[PDB]
Design a protein around this ligand. Sequence first.
Ligand SMILES: CC(C)CN(C[C@@H](O)[C@H](Cc1ccccc1)NC(=O)[C@@H]1CN(c2ccccc2O)C(=O)O1)S(=O)(=O)c1ccc2c(c1)OCO2
Lengths: 99, 99
Amino acid sequence: PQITLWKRPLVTIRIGGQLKEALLDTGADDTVLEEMNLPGKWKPKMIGGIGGFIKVRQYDQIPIEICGHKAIGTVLVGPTPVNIIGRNLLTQIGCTLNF
Amino acid sequence: PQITLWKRPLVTIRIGGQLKEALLDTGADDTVLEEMNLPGKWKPKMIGGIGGFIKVRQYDQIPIEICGHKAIGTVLVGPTPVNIIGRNLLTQIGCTLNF
Ligand SMILES: CC(C)CN(C[C@@H](O)[C@H](Cc1ccccc1)NC(=O)[C@@H]1CN(c2ccccc2O)C(=O)O1)S(=O)(=O)c1ccc2c(c1)OCO2
């Protein structure tokens, strides 16, 4: 697909067995999801942006479907105001910026 | 150009006659640059990121050349961790996401 940027590039993702809406975010190194009680081992991490840092839980090798495209990788879980698909997964679904 | 996402989509911009490096950020509504001087009037504003809210200076109708493509639009100046080109200007230079 081609997604214009007149509005926020929100798309449907699937993780665990939850469908969520998430930003396709070229400015995010990592994928950061709103708080959810995922199974498995995790490690603590702090990630920074505008306003400062938040504490997150790093889960590895989590399968995620993004607009029907399969991905699997690291997902950070914490008190983000928006679900963010970062470059670690955008590359996996073949996403590019074009102009 | 087509820009893949295995690396941060950093580009050179020209603004106020100065060259800077900035991140093409589809997860950002607004363009936010690190502390700098710009001429003309500005308005105090607040924006919210992953870590909380910050104060910024809103400069309107500012010309900015991004990777050789011309935009003229709003630029926010404040304590962002990195210069970010948000959707208000990405749309001007005809940027889309594709996969
Ligand atoms: C600031 C950039 C460099 C990084 N951010 C991604 C942005 O796309 C972010 C994603 C994002 C979007 C919204 C809310 C939180 C985060 N956008 C914004 O902060 C700006 C603020 N804002 C905004 C919000 C409200 C009013 C005016 C505004 O301009 C807006 O529209 O975009 S991030 O969310 O902090 C981030 C994501 C993954 C990461 C990371 C940091 O480190 C490791 O892995």
